[model samples]
Target: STGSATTTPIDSLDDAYITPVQIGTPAQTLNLDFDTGSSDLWVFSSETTASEVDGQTIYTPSKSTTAKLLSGATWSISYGDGSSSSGDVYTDTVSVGGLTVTGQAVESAKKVSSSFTEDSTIDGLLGLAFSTLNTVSPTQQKTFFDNAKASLDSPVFTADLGYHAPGTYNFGFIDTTAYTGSITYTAVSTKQGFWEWTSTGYAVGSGTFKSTSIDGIADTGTTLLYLPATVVSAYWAQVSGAKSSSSVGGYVFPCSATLPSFTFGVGSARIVIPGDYIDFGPISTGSSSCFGGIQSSAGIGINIFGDVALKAAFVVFNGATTPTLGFASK
Candidate 1:
């Protein structure tokens, strides 16, 4: 089955995108963050601590006749940003867009950290990464995409993110009309449990492409473009008044500083991110200092080509036996 659904950015700077997911018998709807960086589909549930459920949607297994407990199953996920999840497990009929997967693992949260509870817009997360990254223990399960792979017309999915407009997620087929030019297919390394790929090199603004190689994951859940320390510094150097400010935890620059477009290679093609996308909103509301959308991945385990980069191109996630990623100008 080929399915399509709208996924919208929740904030002005395209911080995070949300897609509607239906779970259980009665179709309880939840707007979940679709993350290609991790593999665990979880939701806020009736089992969640009462105090933490304010303004957020909740999933109750008791309300769905088709729900079944995944006996002795549990999960816990901790994002580097301090958001956390620890949960029990249930399996139920799950639907995204028009695609349905019966008996799909739907983690039921028992507790969540402060960051999650405070963000009322996101109810949970839908995993799009490899099943090897699934957080469930004792009996790991396949992601919704993986579970439906065989049934799809094509074992593929695509993510199309817009700058300020609504983006979309497609299952089973590539929406050719959603992209432009030729698609540049690249080898994907799921070795580290992510849609990881290696870029031959990158160029700063109108500069020539360097011969450096950079490895990073394409993460829809993340909000920025993180690259090698050297690459990040080079990009920042071109902007006057831009400097690493540990006090603010990232490079901050004069609010009026003009940012240069960043370009990176995907196979023989190049994807250029408009400078407007790099001037992340103000460090503080109405403040003169603005946070950059591109930051250094130094000390961090992996570099990530998140929304900042994804929004600049059309991305395809192919769930073949040996997976691959497709990139194109959009």
Candidate 2:
């Protein structure tokens, strides 16, 4: 049991991907980005390409006294954003607060894409959202949760993304102290591997929201929240002086304009999307504007609620145990 793995679920009320945490004894405080898109834990090292890193935080491996390298296990990952990075596998005597996990999976990227080459605030990523999407396997083996789950005192894991933009991702146990309100529990759906639900209707700008007796997926990897084309068009038509522009490769609207409040209901619970989020940006330097929350994903099978929607409430994933999500207040 001395060399076993364990986890401590980080609590968050917000839905952002990155959560700042302190790891190690004498605790080397670091901010770890939580990504559900892929499962691979990595940290910036001195050997990483200087130009390939930017705006992200980097950690100096030399600063840790209890670190181990997985000689044969090394890897690289590329995202849809055309960004990629690679690093060698290693384990360390890792700890979060008083909890310690032995041989925790870690990677130090040697080659990184120019776009993410220099983010001083982004030290690295912690891919604990789920185990199925892990990038490393077979030959180069290790999982962030696999090695850490055994080290935790409690078998249950929970997360809290409190009022912050991006919430924390914890393992093993949930921290209820992160928030001051009661949590609302929803029955988990195993229809899809990720957290999903069915919604009867959706509305935008008070222009009669279209109803969809379809399933929607809650995804953190997506940058822009996506909705059905019918819903997108209806919402866009309601905005004042709405025009099409391509800056983020998606429809964006003027920041100063007031957009309509969009809402979605799950049975009796209603969730609203604010105006600021509707007019996220003015796509072009001086374009008329476009609706933010409502975007066209014409043929997509399901709607995706990224971090933007996650911040509005607390979310929980029960993993292989029961396949369900629990919602709470921050």
Candidate 3:
């Protein structure tokens, strides 16, 4: 069966896109972040400590007759930003859009870090990475997409992440009307349990495109675009009053700066990010300083094409034998 779901931005292009997901017999609905950076379908649940559960809805497995405990099984996950969640396991009916996966592994979070608890609106995370990256012990768990792929008409899913707007995640098929021009395909390496690929090069504004190949991961969970320190410096140099601020923990520029557009080369197609998107709002609301959406991936081993970069184009996460990524201007 095929499925599709609308993805809503949690903040003004400042966080991951969230989609509705149903779990268990009576279909408990939750707003889950569809993350492609990691693998594990976990949710805030009754198992979570009351103090840890803020305003978010909790998934009550006990209320579902279809819920079955995976005895002795547990799962834990940590994100790049240091957010984490750990929980017990349950096998239940999990569905996205019209697609259903019976006996799907659902990690019920018993513990969540401050990062997650603070985000009161996010109920859970639905990982879309390779099943091999699943955190469930003994027997690894498969993602909703992985479990439903075999039954899908096509082994593909398209992510149309919009900037401060609503987008759609289409499964089993691609909507040609959703994108303009042709999609440029690139082979991805899932060895690291991510949609990893190398860009031909990049350039700041209308500058000449460089030929340096930069390896990075396409991460919807990440909020900003991270590149090599050298590449980041090159782009920041073009902006007057832009400096690496320790206080802000990244490059900051004057709010009035006329930021130039950043472009990345994917095969022959050039995906350009608008200047306004680079000014990632004020460091603090009502503050005159603004943090740049692009930062240096110094400590982080791999560069990340986060929402900032991904939103500039339509992405296709093809799950065929040789998993590939396709990017197109939207």
lDDT of 3 by residue, 1-330 (tens): 788899998887457788999999899999999898989999999999889999998899999999999999999888999889999999999888888889899999999999899998899999998998999998888998888888988999888888889888888998989999999999899999999999999999989999889999988888899999999999999999999998789999998899999999899889999998787878898987889999999999899999889999999999998999999999
- Residue 316 of model 2: what lDDT? 59
Residue clash pairs of candidate 3: none
What candidate 3 gets wrong by more than 4 Å, as runs, is: none
Q: RMSD in angstroms, candidate 1?
A: 0.9
Ranking by lDDT: 1, 3, 2
lDDT-better candidate, 1 vs 2:
1
| Reference-based TM-score, model 3 | 0.98
CA lDDT of every candidate = 0.92, 0.58, 0.92
User: In order, how many clashes per candidate?
Assistant: 0, 43, 0
lDDT (Cα) of model 1: 0.92
Provide TM-scores for the models: 0.98, 0.76, 0.98
